[PDB]
RNA sequence: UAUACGUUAAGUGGAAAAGGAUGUGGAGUUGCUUAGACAACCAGGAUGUUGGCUUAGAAGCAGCCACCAUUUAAAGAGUGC
RNA sequence: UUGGCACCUCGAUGUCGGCUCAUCGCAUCCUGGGGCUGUAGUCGGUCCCAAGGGUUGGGCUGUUCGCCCAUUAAAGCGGUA
């Protein structure tokens, strides 16, 4: 109970830290591809996560993206992120933010351009 | 599919004869090239995958020894304990945990080395050997 | 069937019910397949 | 006649041994079929097969089983073979070891006096063979003006070369299949009686007189204390030597 | 099986199991327990049978503590005999059982092996039964 | 063919046990639970590793011992086929 | 069934086996209908529903029972003083 209001606090923490932040699908793909991700992230030194909807919405207001299955990727990154999609193909990158400024799909995109 | 083989010892024909002969291709031509490629120490059992596509388009990878081959060599031992955390009959140094983790980096999950070494210390518990 | 009064499940698959206020077992292994009688 | 009893006893044992011994036969099969476990038919009565020096093997089968269950039945075979053959290796094992100790014990009733045969029937009562307290070692004289016991009883022997001595003192023994065991206190002295123990061995003996002996002498640290009296030795050196005289004494 | 070594009487009356048990009604030696709904004669055998279940089914499983022995004979005449001459000869031994009583614990083991257990021995047992555990 | 309140539905009543059962009724205790539970559906369910011993072979699953660490949101050195 | 108890019967309840005559139960031998199978098929095992009908002739023995020969779809178990 009060161990997710913690949780939801951390998040809204390393949220308010950062200043990029994706937001995706981890749907269709199995563990080895995640982990490769994971690796990949790791040299780049990306931080990449997983939560419930339900307490990241409540870490934000502390919006339509936020339903269904979905992952995390700070940079305190969208290039590793798009060309692990343009791999595999199985995903959504539904969403980002940049400074607080929330980044559409294609603004995530050019970044990563 | 996988196959531990040792390095110099390719074509002991009876497990592994039986491991391709579901798959037809030639089973001693592919053995010499094994052993061809592991030019190694022979008895170093390699783990070698192999891929054949339908048209018999085979292709195989040798990859890094289990992490019992490398501690057997380290201790110098043939078998690891009968009953760990009950008679521990086994040790190696700290020097070559170091050594076995950056050996197998490459193919780990774990980008820690020491993180890799807790994997590995992990093993050394299945199998009997404590550290020094 | 097996047929007996002791009617129980075998494996975590068997699934008791009643049926004509009978009790009886069901499974897709006919071998757990049970009635009282 | 309990000797000669288990000396015919294992005779049967052998000869009998030589009518079930297919064992690595049914192995080898199970290991060529688990090889070829994919050219075979389940109804097929036999299989051309090669091993693994290219031979080409035509292996039986029972035409109503799988080659799985019938390469299983080979090995189920190996396994009992095994397991017949060991539990005859362990009777010969057993009939030999007391065929031995028999043989010492004849060769210690031969050089015996009655105060050891006294011991030794309590020995064997003990052995559960029979039905119905320190003293323990006998010596003479020896070189280098010293003294040397010994013991024509297993159970004294024993009860010397662990109760009397160190662990560091030389125990003299045969060098060969049966003979008493003797040694002097802290037995450290000269060749002199180093050689005079090799007397004594020779003396009491598998074969008494017999002028080609040859005894073993070893440090009691390595005297194996593992039926009884069956000591083997380790840390031992072996000189060949001969009987003698009662200037042993 | 077991048995007293001596007794004073080898042929006693038979009783009456009337109400409850006076003592070793709750488990202090061990820790989960078994205890009786009724009252009946149980024998060496039923005893031995039920320890034996149990003991098998935890295989090293700490200890045990029967609460019971089988103090009482019981007789039995022989067969196709008309009555009277004499009071028959013994059989075999029983003890006598009271409801509220505890029969067997356990210590050492989990719950849920307990439990197990004490059904196994209860259906070799004849009476109705219930699982205790220490306060 | 009463009154009121409830129960049972088996013809129990109007014959009987051990034992078995999501039968129903009443009390009671307790875990989880709209910061979203149970079920269902979608997806994942991995790496050292085929944990080691034993075994001809035992590769999560004949059996003995152990049952750790990594990616980790989580995956048991493994629940059943 | 072997039995236990002595309740009717000692001013009489005739007792084994066999013949004739059947009759009832079903815990079914066959036939019928099914489940499971360590049920490939043919044959089977086991269990369930079913008592409609049928359920052999001889040798030995007083015999019942039983063994044997040859058949049969099968050669049922019992109650009725």
């Given at each position: 109970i009060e161990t997710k209001k913690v949780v939801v606090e951390e998040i809204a923490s390393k949220l308010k830290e950062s200043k990029s932040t994706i937001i995706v699908d981890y749907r269709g793909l199995n563990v080895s591809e995640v982990t490769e991700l994971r690796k990949q992230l790791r040299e780049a030194n990306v931080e990449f996560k997983v939560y419930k909807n339900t307490m990241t919405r409540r870490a934000v207001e502390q919006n339509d993206f936020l339903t269904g299955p979905n992952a995390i990727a700070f940079s305190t990154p969208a290039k590793v992120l798009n060309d692990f999609a343009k791999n595999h193909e199985a995903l959504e990158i539904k969403a980002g933010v940049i400074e607080g400024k929330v980044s559409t799909v294609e603004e995530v995109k050019a970044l990563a351009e | 599919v996988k196959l531990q083989i040792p390095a110099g010892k390719a074509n002991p024909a009876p497990p592994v004869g039986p491991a391709l002969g579901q798959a037809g291709v030639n089973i001693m031509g592919f053995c010499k090239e094994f052993n061809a490629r592991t030019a190694d120490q022979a008895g170093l059992i390699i783990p070698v995958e192999i891929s054949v596509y339908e048209d018999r388009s085979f292709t195989f990878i040798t990859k890094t020894p289990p992490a019992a081959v490398l501690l057997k060599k380290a201790a110098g031992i043939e078998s690891g304990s009968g009953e760990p955390n009950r008679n521990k009959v086994a040790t190696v140094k700290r020097d070559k945990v170091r050594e076995i983790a950056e050996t197998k980096m490459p193919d780990?999950?774990?980008?820690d080395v020491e993180a890799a070494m807790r994997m590995v210390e992990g093993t050394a518990r299945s199998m009997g050997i404590v550290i020094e | 069937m097996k047929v007996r009064p002791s009617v129980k499940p075998i494996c975590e698959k068997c699934k008791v019910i009643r049926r004509k206020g009978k009790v009886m077992v069901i499974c897709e292994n006919p071998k757990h397949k049970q009635k009282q009688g | 006649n309990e000797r000669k009893k288990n000396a015919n006893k294992i005779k049967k044992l052998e000869k009998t041994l030589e009518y079930s011994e297919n064992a690595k036969e049914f192995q080898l099969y199970g290991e060529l079929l688990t090889a070829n476990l994919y050219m075979l038919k389940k109804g097929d009565k036999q299989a051309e097969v090669i091993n693994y020096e290219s031979p080409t093997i035509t292996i039986p089968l029972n035409?109503?089983?799988?080659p799985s269950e019938n390469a299983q039945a080979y090995f189920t075979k190996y396994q009992k073979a095994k397991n017949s053959v060991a539990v005859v290796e362990e009777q010969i094992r057993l009939a030999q070891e007391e065929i031995e100790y028999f043989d010492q014990l004849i060769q210690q009733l031969s050089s015996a006096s009655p105060r050891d045969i006294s011991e030794i029937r309590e020995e064997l009562v003990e052995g559960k063979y029979l039905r119905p307290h320190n003293p323990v070692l006998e010596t003479y004289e020896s070189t280098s003006g010293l003294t040397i016991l010994v013991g024509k009883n297993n159970r004294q022997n024993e009860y010397l070369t662990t109760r009397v001595a160190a662990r560091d003192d030389i125990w003299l023994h045969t060098k060969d299949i049966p003979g008493s065991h003797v040694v002097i206190r802290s037995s450290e002295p000269d060749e002199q009686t180093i050689m005079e123990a090799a007397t004594i061995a020779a003396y009491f003996s598998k074969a008494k007189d017999s002028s080609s002996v040859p005894v073993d002498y070893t440090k009691i640290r390595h005297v194996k204390k593992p039926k009884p009296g069956f000591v083997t030795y380790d840390s031992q050196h072996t000189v060949f030597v001969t009987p003698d005289a009662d200037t042993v004494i | 099986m077991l048995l007293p070594k001596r007794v004073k009487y080898r042929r006693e009356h038979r009783g009456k199991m009337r109400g409850r048990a006076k003592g070793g009604t709750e488990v202090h030696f061990g820790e989960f327990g078994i205890q009786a709904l009724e009252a009946s004669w149980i024998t060496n055998r039923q005893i031995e049978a039920a320890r034996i279940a149990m003991t098998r089914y935890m295989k090293r499983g700490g200890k045990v503590w029967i609460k019971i022995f089988p103090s009482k004979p019981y007789t039995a005449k022989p067969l196709e005999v008309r009555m009277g001459s004499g009071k028959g000869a013994p059989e075999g031994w029983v003890a006598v059982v009271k409801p509220g009583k505890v029969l067997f614990e356990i210590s050492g083991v989990s719950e849920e092996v307990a439990r197990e257990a004490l059904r196994l021995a209860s259906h070799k047992l004849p009476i109705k039964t219930k699982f205790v555990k220490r306060e």
């Amino acid at each position: 109970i009060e161990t997710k209001k913690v949780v939801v606090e951390e998040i809204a923490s390393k949220l308010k830290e950062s200043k990029s932040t994706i937001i995706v699908d981890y749907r269709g793909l199995n563990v080895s591809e995640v982990t490769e991700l994971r690796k990949q992230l790791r040299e780049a030194n990306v931080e990449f996560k997983v939560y419930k909807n339900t307490m990241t919405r409540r870490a934000v207001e502390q919006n339509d993206f936020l339903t269904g299955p979905n992952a995390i990727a700070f940079s305190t990154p969208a290039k590793v992120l798009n060309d692990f999609a343009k791999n595999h193909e199985a995903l959504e990158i539904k969403a980002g933010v940049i400074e607080g400024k929330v980044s559409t799909v294609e603004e995530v995109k050019a970044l990563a351009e | 599919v996988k196959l531990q083989i040792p390095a110099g010892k390719a074509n002991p024909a009876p497990p592994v004869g039986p491991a391709l002969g579901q798959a037809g291709v030639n089973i001693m031509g592919f053995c010499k090239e094994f052993n061809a490629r592991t030019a190694d120490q022979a008895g170093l059992i390699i783990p070698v995958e192999i891929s054949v596509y339908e048209d018999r388009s085979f292709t195989f990878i040798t990859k890094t020894p289990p992490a019992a081959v490398l501690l057997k060599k380290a201790a110098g031992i043939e078998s690891g304990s009968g009953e760990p955390n009950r008679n521990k009959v086994a040790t190696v140094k700290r020097d070559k945990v170091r050594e076995i983790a950056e050996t197998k980096m490459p193919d780990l999950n774990a980008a820690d080395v020491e993180a890799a070494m807790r994997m590995v210390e992990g093993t050394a518990r299945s199998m009997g050997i404590v550290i020094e | 069937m097996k047929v007996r009064p002791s009617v129980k499940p075998i494996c975590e698959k068997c699934k008791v019910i009643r049926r004509k206020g009978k009790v009886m077992v069901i499974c897709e292994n006919p071998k757990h397949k049970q009635k009282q009688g | 006649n309990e000797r000669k009893k288990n000396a015919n006893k294992i005779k049967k044992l052998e000869k009998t041994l030589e009518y079930s011994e297919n064992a690595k036969e049914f192995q080898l099969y199970g290991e060529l079929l688990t090889a070829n476990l994919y050219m075979l038919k389940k109804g097929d009565k036999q299989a051309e097969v090669i091993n693994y020096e290219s031979p080409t093997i035509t292996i039986p089968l029972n035409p109503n089983k799988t080659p799985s269950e019938n390469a299983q039945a080979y090995f189920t075979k190996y396994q009992k073979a095994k397991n017949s053959v060991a539990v005859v290796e362990e009777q010969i094992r057993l009939a030999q070891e007391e065929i031995e100790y028999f043989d010492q014990l004849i060769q210690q009733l031969s050089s015996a006096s009655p105060r050891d045969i006294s011991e030794i029937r309590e020995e064997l009562v003990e052995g559960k063979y029979l039905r119905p307290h320190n003293p323990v070692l006998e010596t003479y004289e020896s070189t280098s003006g010293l003294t040397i016991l010994v013991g024509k009883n297993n159970r004294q022997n024993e009860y010397l070369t662990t109760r009397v001595a160190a662990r560091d003192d030389i125990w003299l023994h045969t060098k060969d299949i049966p003979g008493s065991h003797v040694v002097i206190r802290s037995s450290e002295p000269d060749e002199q009686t180093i050689m005079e123990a090799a007397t004594i061995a020779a003396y009491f003996s598998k074969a008494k007189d017999s002028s080609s002996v040859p005894v073993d002498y070893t440090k009691i640290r390595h005297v194996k204390k593992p039926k009884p009296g069956f000591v083997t030795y380790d840390s031992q050196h072996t000189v060949f030597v001969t009987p003698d005289a009662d200037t042993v004494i | 099986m077991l048995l007293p070594k001596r007794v004073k009487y080898r042929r006693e009356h038979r009783g009456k199991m009337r109400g409850r048990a006076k003592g070793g009604t709750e488990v202090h030696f061990g820790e989960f327990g078994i205890q009786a709904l009724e009252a009946s004669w149980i024998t060496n055998r039923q005893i031995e049978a039920a320890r034996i279940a149990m003991t098998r089914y935890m295989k090293r499983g700490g200890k045990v503590w029967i609460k019971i022995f089988p103090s009482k004979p019981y007789t039995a005449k022989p067969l196709e005999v008309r009555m009277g001459s004499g009071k028959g000869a013994p059989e075999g031994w029983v003890a006598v059982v009271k409801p509220g009583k505890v029969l067997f614990e356990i210590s050492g083991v989990s719950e849920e092996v307990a439990r197990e257990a004490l059904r196994l021995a209860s259906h070799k047992l004849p009476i109705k039964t219930k699982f205790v555990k220490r306060e």
